Write a protein that binds this DNA or RNA. Structure first.
Ligand SMILES: [Mg+2]
Ligand SMILES: [Mg+2]
Ligand SMILES: [Mg+2]
Ligand SMILES: [Mg+2]
Ligand SMILES: [Mg+2]
Ligand SMILES: [Mg+2]
Ligand SMILES: [Mg+2]
Ligand SMILES: [Mg+2]
Ligand SMILES: [Mg+2]
Ligand SMILES: [Mg+2]
Ligand SMILES: [Mg+2]
Ligand SMILES: [Zn+2]
Lengths: 148, 211, 287, 285, 108, 152, 159
RNA sequence: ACUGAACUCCUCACACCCAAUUGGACCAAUCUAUCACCCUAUAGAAGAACUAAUGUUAGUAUAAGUAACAUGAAAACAUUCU
């Protein structure tokens, strides 16, 4: 629920689209068992898809560790120092490809609740409403029941 | 209680009869209750024969060199609190007397060059060899607390130390370890302490008076 | 300049404390037997020219800190924050003692000095204020006094009720700050260095350095204010509970300048008086 | 720590402070005995519809008093002890409907009052009174604050209302307190009669005839019973009962002034119907 | 009746921790000038009263030794004397209870 | 409602309160100093001073000897009341006893009191002294007394 | 049974630096299986929670409750080990930082079950003058808080 | 005229609001087979899943520090007195 969870406002990392666009995903860390039934789809991902993926975005450095694990993981690290550890346990190659592209496409900000769907930093251009917009002035700045 | 008489009289008044039982194993001591001949500082080649007849490869001309390394290394085991090496370097009469009060506080002893050469003074003697050595050194101390605040001695400044260190050996697998350290009665007072002390008077029950 | 006065006087003061602590033989440790009526025969093994009688009191209890005011060190009255000097014997003197003569005198000297600390920083800047002394008034005599010489502009000035009330409000502002009284026994040369711009206090230092076999003179500092006393003082300003600057009088045989005396009366936090008794003690303190 | 006045005084200084402070109380009560040789406020005559000051009196106790028809009347004595006017507040500063006089009675120790009160009485120049009651009053009756009020402020024949705390009976149950012993209403109404603290509340007895005043000892002898125990302080005002709203013609209007020295009063004023002591034994012929 | 519900620790903490149930910091407490153990004003010092109690205990024991048996109240005033004290001229015609310690500083 | 009720109700009746007080008064004529709980002590203090006022009425008085016969349960104390206590206090007219508070009883935490008879052989109590006349406030007030004496 | 509070006096800090404030001492002491209830000790433990040890001792000598004497023994004992064992120079210079009371291992007595209640008492003393009590907040603090809440507010549910 | 739904439209997604009943897809933990080797896989099995039976046992609350309970007095602790 929203009152149990933390929330935040919609943001970028360093104004990520203004000047240029920067891929926010630094490192991936696959760890894949050689003999092991859970990292089968990871194995077929390293053999088929990880080299193509590693070429489609060179700003991402990818480490395939290949130790005897009992659950394989991917660990995405982001430029703002966030770490998302997700499992690729008993997943097909296609499911792992959609997960890794999902991690590539996003940023390191939390996937907690976002309060507003928008973020201007300059919301007003004609000048924000204060209670003396849309009011006429008087002669000599008088107020009601002011004599002189 | 405070002694064995209090416990045995309390066990007699209570009715605790403790039978003194006969066991074939006893305690295998490797030390001595104190010093054989109390060397009082300002002919004992008998005991050197009574050492060489057991050890048979023993040069006194090399020993205060060794006695330096048994001394200094042992003190460095206080800087890390490595008790397992101290049991090789120091006797068990000497181990509590140097490590008990130092518990729960960090010490930072260090050695710097000796003023004099260390030289052996006397030698005495199921058999316990015992060698007293005169050392005239320069050492540094800083005893801290549980809270890491200095309670004894400037850390940098070396001080000149006289040390009448008594060593002891078992006479099969034993070696020379520090047994005690004689402090002469004429010796100057030590460094004063950084804190102040109140020493209480007699706590008087109402029926008594102060005189 | 007055700011230059307080700065240069406090700097000479801290030169003398800096020279004063530097001549230690590296924490010599002298012991003082608590020769006293209660909790008897307890030695304090203390640092030589560092630890004061207040720290002996701190070894005993909070009670002996809060209630004790002087110390008979070897039968001599001593400040609570004056550092000890040698192996000695301490009593602790309170207000409610059997015969508290020296504590009444110490309280009295203190209140006169606090008054001078109010007088100097009371007037606007174009008026020369000049503190000659605090005469030793008996406590039976009604009010502690402080002789002050004022500027020739204020030759004919006599304060209103509201000006004496403003003096008291500055005094309660001085109590509320909770300032200790630092002491320094200084030889007469540096004593003349600090007060080198007042003829009256110079002559006072000269008359008092002529009284001891050395040239030794007591200085006291409240906060940024130095003065010469005749003897010991109270440990803190926070002891004075009721305090009133009650009157101003002008002495009569005044051909060179007015020796304009100020009157005041005060009681500690221990010997508080009821409001009506306090009013009668105000009235008698205006003679 | 807290203190009291006696705490730090020697054996020598305790009766000294008793004699000192007691003597200043007697001097301060003695200095106010000439209000008209002082500078009073302008004395007006009685106008129809004006109110004057009341008093504060001790309740001395009761005694019988026989009238000329041979009927008992139980009568409380009310001594006026050191009554004085303390502060006048006009109607503008009060924001009430009417001006007010604060009047207090029975001098009480200076060593036992808050310092705001002691500053008040110090500036006023009086020893502090035990109670201060407040009188609603017209502008015509306003004596200067600091003036003595006497027993002859009232005169016999006058009717009077007296208010005091009733004798407190502490926590009492229903039979003593109220004198006795729904389903669909699921609750107990406010103001239901239940056990609780009886007495120790202000109550006013209305319309009590003043039978006799004693000018020397300053006693008022009032008909019947007054709320409160003996030696209690009561607030004695002229009666508000509308059968008695116009008889302020003969009453001295600001207050009675012995300082005025005009046709001074006897020992004791009696009402016309009172059998005085010393009169011959009454016969109904 | 019996409780309809179970009271909670929030209600309970509000009940048993409000200041009507807390212990009041008292400030009668002084230091006895003679002994230095802290006493209370308006109450005798426990320590000094224990001194006086113990000495009246020894004196009453020796009263019991010099009387011997019950129902021996003398028709004479009594005087307590310590070691090395002559009975005064005022102490004549008074029974005497000799002690074995010194005269205390506070007995007079 | 107990306005003007002057007597503590004690013991297990009126008779039993008079026997409790009689035992305390007997204890205090015998020993001349008593620790007992506080309310019992001041009740009995009222009775104690009256008992000496009957002791001053003479040995030969019949009424006094009836009162002493009742109030002293040990009969040897009746020569003491008419030859030791009553001659002792033949000067002063009242104030024969002094009462102070002890610290509370260790057992059940009761308010405790001592009464003694004044001028007894027992070691003196640590009486609450007034503050010294040589203190700061007492010297200011002594000076003020000297000025108000100088008015004449 | 857990016994973590006794061990807290065995933490050894690494020695400090000259450019560093002096760390105050901390002395954890307790007593276990006091035959008293844990909620009657709460009042005595609560009473002394920021006091200097002399004020705490003084307040517990004149209290009539059973636990006061027990806590006074715990505080005198902890003042002793404060000075002897833990390098506190002044006896006077302590204050009660923590004073709580947990429940102990109770017993059950069949009469009809009735518990024989036990408790503990935990005290941490800290070297130093007792910290000054929190002043009641003034109308300046209330007014600043209120205005700061007014400055804080945003146009809500829009851009 | 405006407001006004989970109706309808709109951007993307759709297997994703009934009792008893009935059909289906998955599945925690355990043990066995064989893998696996920071806690798994494919099967085989079964004492295989608890917000509820005035359930059973144990712990600890609440009512509640409530109800209730207890020691004749002084003293030299001998003794005496009621
Ligand atoms: Mg209803
Ligand atoms: Mg009863
Ligand atoms: Mg629909
Ligand atoms: Mg699974
Ligand atoms: Mg099952
Ligand atoms: Mg369950
Ligand atoms: Mg049920
Ligand atoms: Mg169930
Ligand atoms: Mg209940
Ligand atoms: Mg009950
Ligand atoms: Mg019984
Ligand atoms: Zn005492």
């Amino acid at each position: 629920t929203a009152r149990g969870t933390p929330s935040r406002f919609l943001a970028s990392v360093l104004h990520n689209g203004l000047g240029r666009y920067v891929q926010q995903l630094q490192r991936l860390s696959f760890s894949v068992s050689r003999d092991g039934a859970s990292s089968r789809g990871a194995r077929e991902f390293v053999e088929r898809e990880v080299i193509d993926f590693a070429r489609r975005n060179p700003g991402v450095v990818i480490y395939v560790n290949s130790r005897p694990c009992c659950v394989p993981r991917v660990v995405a690290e982001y430029l703002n120092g966030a770490v998302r550890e997700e499992s690729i346990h008993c997943k097909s190659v296609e499911e792992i490809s959609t997960l890794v592209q999902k991690l590539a496409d996003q940023s390191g900000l939390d996937v907690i609740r976002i309060r507003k769907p928008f973020h201007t930093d300059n919301p007003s251009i004609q000048g924000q409403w204060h209670p003396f917009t849309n009011k006429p002035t008087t002669f000599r700045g008088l107020r009601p029941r002011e004599v002189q | 209680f405070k002694t064995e008489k209090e416990f045995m009289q309390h066990a007699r008044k209570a009715g605790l009869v403790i039978p003194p039982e006969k066991s074939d194993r006893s305690i295998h001591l490797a030390c001595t209750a104190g010093i054989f001949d109390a060397y009082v500082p300002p002919a004992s080649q008998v005991s050197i024969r009574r050492i060489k007849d057991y050890d048979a490869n023993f040069k006194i001309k090399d020993f205060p060199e060794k006695a330096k390394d048994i001394f200094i290394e042992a003190h460095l085991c206080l800087n890390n609190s490595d008790h397992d090496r101290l049991h090789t370097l120091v006797t068990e009469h000497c181990f509590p007397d140097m490590t008990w009060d130092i518990k729960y506080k960090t010490v930072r002893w260090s050695f710097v060059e000796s003023l004099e050469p260390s030289h052996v003074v006397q030698v005495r003697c199921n058999v316990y060899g015992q060698i007293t050595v005169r050392m005239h050194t320069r050492q540094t101390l800083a005893i801290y607390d549980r809270f890491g605040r200095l309670m004894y001695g400037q850390e940098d400044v070396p001080k000149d130390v006289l040390e009448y260190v008594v060593f002891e050996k078992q006479l099969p697998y034993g070696s020379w370890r520090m047994h005690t350290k004689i402090v002469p009665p004429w010796a100057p007072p030590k460094q004063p302490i950084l804190k102040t002390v109140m020493i209480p008077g007699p706590q008087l029950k109402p029926e008594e008076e102060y005189e | 300049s007055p700011t230059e006065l307080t700065e240069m006087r406090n700097d000479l003061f801290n030169k003398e404390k800096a020279r004063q602590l530097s001549l230690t033989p590296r924490t010599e440790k002298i012991e003082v037997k608590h020769v006293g009526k209660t909790d008897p025969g307890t030695v304090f093994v203390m640092n030589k020219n560092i630890s004061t009688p207040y720290s002996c009191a701190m070894h005993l209890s909070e009670w002996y800190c809060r209630k004790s005011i002087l110390a008979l060190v070897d039968g001599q009255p001593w400040d609570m924050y004056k550092p000890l000097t040698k192996s000695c014997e301490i009593k602790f003197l309170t207000f409610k003692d059997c015969d508290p003569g020296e504590v009444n005198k110490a309280y009295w000297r203190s209140c006169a000095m606090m008054m001078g600390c109010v007088i100097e920083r009371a007037f606007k800047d174009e008026y020369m204020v000049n503190l000659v002394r605090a005469p030793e008034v008996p406590v039976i005599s009604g009010a502690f006094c402080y002789d002050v010489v004022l500027d020739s502009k204020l030759d004919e000035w006599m304060p209103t009720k509201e000006n004496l009330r403003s003096f008291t409000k500055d005094a309660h502002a001085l109590i509320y700050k909770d300032l200790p009284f630092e002491t320094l026994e200084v030889e007469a040369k540096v004593a003349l260095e600090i007060f080198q711009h007042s003829k009256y206090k110079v002559d006072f230092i000269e008359e008092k350095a002529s009284q001891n076999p050395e040239r030794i003179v007591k200085l006291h500092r409240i906060g940024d204010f130095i003065d010469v006393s005749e003897g010991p003082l109270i440990p803190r300003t926070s002891i004075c509970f009721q305090y009133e600057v009650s009157a101003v009088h002008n002495l009569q045989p005044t051909q060179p300048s007015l020796i304009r005396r100020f009157q005041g009366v005060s009681l500690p936090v221990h010997l508080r008086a009821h409001f009506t008794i306090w009013d009668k003690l105000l009235e008698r303190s205006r003679k | 720590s807290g203190t009291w006045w006696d705490e730090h005084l020697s054996e020598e200084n305790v009766p000294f402070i008793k004699q000192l402070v007691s003597d200043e109380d007697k001097a301060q009560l003695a200095s106010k005995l000439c209000p008209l040789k002082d500078e009073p406020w302008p004395i007006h005559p009685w106008e129809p519809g004006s109110f004057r000051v009341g008093l504060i009196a001790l309740k001395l106790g009761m005694m019988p008093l026989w009238t000329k028809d041979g009927q008992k009347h139980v009568v409380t004595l009310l001594q006026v002890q050191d009554c004085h006017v303390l502060k006048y507040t006009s109607k503008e500063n009060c924001n009430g409907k009417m001006a007010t006089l604060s009047v207090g009675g029975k001098t009480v120790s200076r060593f036992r009052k808050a310092t705001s009160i002691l500053e008040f009485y110090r500036e006023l120049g009086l020893p502090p009174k035990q109670t201060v009651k407040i009188f609603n009053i017209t502008d015509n009756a306003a004596i200067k604050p600091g003036t003595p009020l006497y027993a002859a402020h009232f005169r016999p024949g006058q009717y009077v209302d007296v208010t005091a705390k009733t004798i407190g009976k502490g926590f009492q149950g229903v039979m003593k307190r109220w004198g006795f012993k729904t389903g669909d209403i699921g609750r107990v109404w406010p103001g239901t009669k239940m056990p609780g603290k009886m007495g120790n509340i202000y109550r006013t007895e209305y319309g009590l005839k003043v039978w006799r005043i004693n000018t020397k000892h300053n006693i008022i002898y009032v008909n019947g019973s007054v709320p409160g125990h003996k030696n209690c302080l009561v607030k004695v005002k002229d009666s508000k009962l509308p059968a008695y709203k116009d008889l302020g013609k003969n009453l001295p209007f600001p207050t009675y002034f012995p300082d005025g020295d005009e046709e001074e009063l006897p020992e004791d004023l009696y009402d016309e119907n009172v059998c005085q002591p010393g009169a011959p034994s009454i016969t109904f012929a | 009746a019996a409780p309809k519900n179970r009271r909670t620790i929030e209600v309970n903490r509000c009940r048993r921790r409000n200041p009507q149930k807390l212990i009041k910091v008292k400030n009668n407490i002084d230091v006895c000038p003679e002994c230095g153990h802290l006493k209370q004003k308006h109450v005798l010092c426990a320590y000094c009263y224990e001194k006086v109690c113990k000495e009246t205990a020894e004196i009453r024991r020796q009263i019991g030794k010099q009387e011997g048996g019950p129902f021996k109240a003398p028709t004479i005033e009594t005087v307590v004397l310590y070691t090395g004290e002559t009975p005064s001229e005022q102490d004549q015609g008074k029974r005497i209870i000799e002690r074995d310690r010194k005269r205390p500083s506070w007995f007079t | 409602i107990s306005h003007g009720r002057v007597f503590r109700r004690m013991g297990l009746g009126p008779e039993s309160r008079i026997h409790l007080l009689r035992n305390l008064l007997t204890g205090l004529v015998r020993h001349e100093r008593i620790e007992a709980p506080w309310a019992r002590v001041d009740e009995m203090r009222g009775y104690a001073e009256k008992l000496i006022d009957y002791g001053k009425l003479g040995d030969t008085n019949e009424r006094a000897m009836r009162m002493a016969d009742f109030w002293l349960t040990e009969k040897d104390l009746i020569p003491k009341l008419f030859q030791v206590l009553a001659p002792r206090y033949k000067d002063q007219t009242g104030g024969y006893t002094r009462m102070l508070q002890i610290p509370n009883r260790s057992l059940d935490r009761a308010k405790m009191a001592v009464i003694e008879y004044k001028g007894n052989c027992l070691p003196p109590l640590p009486l609450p002294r007034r503050d010294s006349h040589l203190t700061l406030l007492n010297q200011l007030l002594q000076g003020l007394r000297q000025d108000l004496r100088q008015s004449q | 049974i857990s016994r973590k509070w006794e061990k807290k006096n065995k933490i050894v800090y690494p020695p400090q630096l000259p450019g560093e404030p002096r760390r105050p001492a901390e002395i954890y002491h307790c007593r276990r299986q006091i035959k008293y209830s844990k909620d009657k000790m709460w009042y005595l433990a609560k009473l002394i929670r920021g006091m200097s040890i002399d004020q705490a001792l003084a307040q517990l000598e004149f209290n009539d409750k059973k636990g006061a004497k027990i806590i006074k023994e715990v505080l005198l004992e902890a003042q002793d080990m404060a000075v002897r064992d833990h390098n506190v120079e002044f006896r006077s210079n302590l204050y009660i930082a923590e004073s709580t009371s947990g429940r102990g291992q109770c017993l059950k007595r069949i009469r009809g079950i009735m518990e024989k209640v036990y408790c503990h008492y935990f005290v941490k003393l800290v070297e130093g003058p007792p910290p000054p009590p929190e002043p009641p907040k003034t109308a300046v603090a209330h007014a600043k808080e209120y205005i700061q809440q007014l400055r804080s507010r945003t146009i809500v549910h829009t851009l």
